[PDB]
Amino acid sequence: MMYVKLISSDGHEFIVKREHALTSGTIKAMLSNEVNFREIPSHVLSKVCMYFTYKVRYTNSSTEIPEFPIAPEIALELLMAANFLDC
Amino acid sequence: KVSEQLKCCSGILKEMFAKKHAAYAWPFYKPVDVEALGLHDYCDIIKHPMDMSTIKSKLEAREYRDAQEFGADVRLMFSNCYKYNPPDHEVVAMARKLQDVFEMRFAKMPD
Amino acid sequence: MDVFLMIRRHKTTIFTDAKESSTVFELKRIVEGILKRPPDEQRLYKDDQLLDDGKTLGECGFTSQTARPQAPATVGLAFRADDTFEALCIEPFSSPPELPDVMK
Amino acid sequence: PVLRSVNSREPSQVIFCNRSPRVVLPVWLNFDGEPQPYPTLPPGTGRRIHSYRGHLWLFRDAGTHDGLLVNQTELFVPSLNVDGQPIFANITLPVYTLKERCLQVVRSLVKPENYRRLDIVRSLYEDLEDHPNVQKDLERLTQERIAHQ
């Protein structure tokens, strides 16, 4: 599959599949190859990628779906990140 | 003498199960599922439960001494339904409808 | 079942899925396809433990139960330079702020 | 009203099975269409249910009133039993959006009155305060049902 590089504010490169990234409507618009984010930190953006994996996998899944975990501390930043990325 | 009637008793229950009297006999087919219906109080009130499926088994297992004992269980079935529910309840209305059929046949049994 | 991984070197991180049946060498082919680096110039680790090319990901310890989509298991990576392998180095992510009073 | 149970008085044995981590709240739409909440189901549990033919159901989280799925759909309607076999209702989580899932966590850790004490964008205050409502979701499905005709 086509891969895309998602860079955090603190300079952490995250190589995910293009299909997985298109879950985000913001990224969908940004492309139509390499994408950069000035605000989002590493630990937040890493968790966003884990959602893409989780979303792509368990969508249209007859296998019962587990709860997507979000620790109390990251919740606030991840909420804003999710709102920004539109997903 | 008695075996003649016990076979007629089976004939009655077959009509009670039959599609003819389906509309108002369907609650009394199988035992009262306390879990499904959510009746925590039922077991306290009704000491001796009964249903048509239970009676059917007893007929086939030759557990009724005579046709008189068969009636007691059929009556116990309705008795329990009347005991538990209020007068204006739907299951009671159906209980009466089915009972009035049974009573008609049980009365007109040969001997 | 499938295992979900985070292949990390320095500040790089590859999110990619694999099988328990698949091998470490087959995993290095994924790294080659992305980072242009051939398997002979790769060293894949599990925590501190170095992994063999012949052994499977299931044999290495990566189970589908432990390594899930939402919680993928990390896989260390170290390249070769001047015909000598670097020691495994993974920069950690940034720290979340301490839990506010309202969230306590 | 559109979405409502039919007073059929025709039996339909059902099995609710909470295959989700939430404490499920079974909700039954009455003959007028008003939802009636039934006793909850713990996580990873189930039990037999005596519903009737053409009876609408929907399942939520007892705590947060988050929407759940039953047989990969929102509304559940029992058929008639075939050879008196029970109609199964597999209650599970949906694939929540990262935003709505983030809200659920913030909602659970922060009281309603502390929503405007959080260092976030103005718009997110409305989103948090906009809790998941049953009546609001029924109004959507009703309009979607009309659009389908």
Side-chain angles (χ1 to χ4, degrees), chain D residues 93-105:
Chain D
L93 282 168
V95 182
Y96 287 124
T97 58
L98 188 63
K99 185 175 180 178
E100 183 57 35
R101 179 52 193 159
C102 281
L103 290 177
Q104 283 171 13
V105 170

Side-chain angles (χ1 to χ4, degrees), chain D residues 16 24-28 36-41 49 57:
Chain D
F16 298 166
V24 163
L25 169 52
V27 178
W28 175 74
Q36 309 300 319
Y38 273 61
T40 59
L41 301 174
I49 308 290
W57 286 88

Side-chain angles (χ1 to χ4, degrees), chain D residues 46-114:
Chain D
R47 67 192 308 283
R48 298 184 300 276
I49 308 290
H50 185 84
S51 183
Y52 302 86
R53 185 203 65 76
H55 277 224
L56 268 165
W57 286 88
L58 59 97
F59 306 86
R60 315 287 287 192
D61 189 0
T64 58
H65 291 100
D66 286 318
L68 299 174
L69 296 178
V70 46
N71 309 343
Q72 303 184 323
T73 181
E74 300 192 46
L75 293 173
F76 170 76
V77 195
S79 312
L80 278 169
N81 297 20
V82 193
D83 300 352
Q85 291 172 14
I87 311 306
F88 200 94
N90 193 56
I91 305 158
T92 59
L93 282 168
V95 182
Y96 287 124
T97 58
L98 188 63
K99 185 175 180 178
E100 183 57 35
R101 179 52 193 159
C102 281
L103 290 177
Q104 283 171 13
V105 170
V106 168
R107 282 178 180 127
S108 64
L109 292 169
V110 184
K111 274 206 180 77
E113 55 262 37
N114 291 304

Side-chain angles (χ1 to χ4, degrees), chain A residues 12-37 39-57:
Chain A
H12 260 264
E13 299 182 348
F14 296 103
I15 307 165
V16 303
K17 292 184 179 62
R18 203 176 192 95
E19 185 194 337
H20 288 232
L22 283 168
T23 311
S24 173
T26 300
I27 295 171
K28 189 207 202 79
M30 275 181 172
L31 293 171
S32 56
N33 182 34
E34 185 175 329
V35 180
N36 202 334
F37 300 102
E39 311 282 306
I40 307 172
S42 50
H43 71 276
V44 168
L45 182 51
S46 66
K47 192 67 175 181
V48 169
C49 292
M50 288 172 189
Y51 173 71
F52 296 148
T53 320
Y54 166 86
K55 198 273 187 174
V56 165
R57 171 55 176 80

